[PDB]
Design a protein around this ligand. Structure first.
Ligand code: PP9
Ligand code: OLC
Ligand code: OLC
Ligand code: OLC
Ligand code: OLC
Ligand code: OLC
Ligand code: OLC
Ligand code: OLC
Ligand code: OLC
Ligand code: OLC
Lengths: 157, 157
């Protein structure tokens, strides 16, 4: 088991895809006007938490990918990253809060699944995913509350 | 080497994240009005091309993920899939064409890298990414020609 830099930089580069979704956001008065739970962090917290988790999940996948029988784990990981990349555009871009809520739940389930598979192969890779899963749970709660506490128009069918 | 239905259905399900980008953002009226290159294919072509490629890439990844030392190849697979998911919301959603070109070029590099890495472990998995790399090369040209042939629109530059 090593710090393998070809693996870790490949997974890190991969997190460049969700990274662009967040960067390409402007200040948005639609989001500024939303009612929000008291525990909603300020917007500057999110790039730093997401950045940290990009490093933690890339370090976790890096370990797992040096181990035998890791295919199912890395299938869960590919699915996790892909629905994570899809959420931000759906919520902030298209402003479809219901559809984004379905998305972040499919994400949460694949994050939990990865973490679990990771735990069957490597406790540290599993442990590295725990703050991801927590952050994903809060993200689900935030999307859910944005929809509970606000007016939603109908989405394009 | 087998038909692993859990592996395959996981990779296919991960393809649900990109498949969702098209469903929510079908080619726009704004997209119709862009000047297109002469070889631009009709509009029914793209849903059947992407749908085939999700089955083909999921099948390829399923073979590879059963093999030993497939970590790096699976790492490339997560990388291409994420940049794939990111591309449609950048080009069709935000209409930021120049950023989209960067995105689809990075995607192309990671599709080439997955293919190459698939060939090192399983010849069939490599063969099945061949039409993907071909199609990603066509996607890249379309994105380039969309900017080239619509350079007077601010969203192209
Ligand atoms: C430009 C304006 C930016 C805003 C409003 C911002 C704020 C946000 N970023 C979010 C997600 C995010 N923040 C993120 C990394 C970055 N974000 C960045 C720029 C921004 N980050 C930069 C730069 C990043 C990398 C260096 C990413 C990548 C997401 C999308 C979640 C994900 O896919 O990782 C969310 C949704 C909550 C969550 O992640 O749970 C908010 C409110
Ligand atoms: C904002 C947080 C997101 C951060 C965004 C990423 C930033 C870091 C960039 C590094 C990419 C480098 C690419 C690394 C790919 C290396 C491929 C390689 O090593 O291949 C070896 C293989 O064994 C034979 O091909
Ligand atoms: C909820 C509790 C966990 C979530 C808290 C989120 C904060 C960040 C935590 C990271 C854990 C790992 C930190 C230390 C890194 C592990 C050490 C490592 O793995 O290197 C050892 C190697 O095996 C040679 O001995
Ligand atoms: C177009 C994108 C959308 C595509 C939709 C994605 C498909 C999801 C399937 C759900 C049913 C779940 C059934 C999964 C069956 C598990 C198979 C199983 O456990 O078999 C053991 C395995 O073969 C060990 O080698
Ligand atoms: C419209 C499309 C957008 C949303 C589509 C999302 C699809 C929903 C989730 C599918 C899970 C399918 C997972 C099938 C594989 C899981 C089985 C498994 O985990 O098996 C593990 C075991 O250890 C190995 O034998
Ligand atoms: C590190 C991995 C390598 C991949 C990284 C990808 C970055 C490339 C970015 C390109 C942006 C656009 C630059 C080229 C713009 C051509 C469009 C153009 O302007 O067309 C000519 C003119 O407009 C007609 O009148
Ligand atoms: C939501 C934000 C909360 C999370 C914020 C985290 C900030 C960084 C803190 C933890 C450092 C963890 C260090 C991880 C180092 C483990 C990588 C590694 O050492 O892997 C084993 C190595 O290859 C030899 O065996
Ligand atoms: C099924 C998977 C979705 C489950 C996702 C977990 C949803 C939990 C939402 C949540 O716990 O948010 C905090 C709560 O709203 C604070 O009072
Ligand atoms: C083999 C995997 C398929 C991907 C190939 C992408 C390359 C171009 C696709 C279409 C033209 C190829 C000939 C297709 C012949 C079938 C005729 C057809 O389906 O036409 C649809 C109908 O016209 C709707 O209006
Ligand atoms: C504009 C650029 C267009 C061209 C794009 C080029 C980039 C693709 C890279 C190499 C392809 C070769 C992939 C396979 C490399 C050797 C594989 C090998 O070992 O054999 C494979 C097979 O399993 C038994 O021979």
């Amino acid at each position: 088991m090593n710090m393998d830099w070809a693996l870790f930089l490949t997974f890190l580069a991969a997190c460049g895809a969700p990274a662009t979704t967040g960067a390409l956001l402007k200040p948005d008065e639609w989001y500024d006007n939303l009612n929000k739970p008291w525990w909603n962090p300020p917007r500057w917290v999110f790039p730093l938490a997401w950045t940290s988790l990009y490093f933690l999940m890339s370090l976790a996948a890096m370990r797992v990918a040096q181990l035998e029988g890791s295919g199912q784990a890395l299938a869960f990981y590919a699915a996790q990253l892909a629905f994570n990349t899809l959420w931000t555009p759906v919520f902030f871009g298209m402003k479809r809060m219901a559809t984004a809520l379905a998305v972040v739940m499919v994400m949460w389930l694949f994050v939990a699944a990865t973490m679990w598979a990771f735990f069957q192969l490597d406790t540290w890779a599993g442990v590295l995913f725990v703050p991801y899963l927590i952050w994903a749970t809060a993200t689900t709660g935030l999307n859910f509350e944005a929809m509970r506490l606000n007016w939603n128009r109908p989405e394009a069918r």
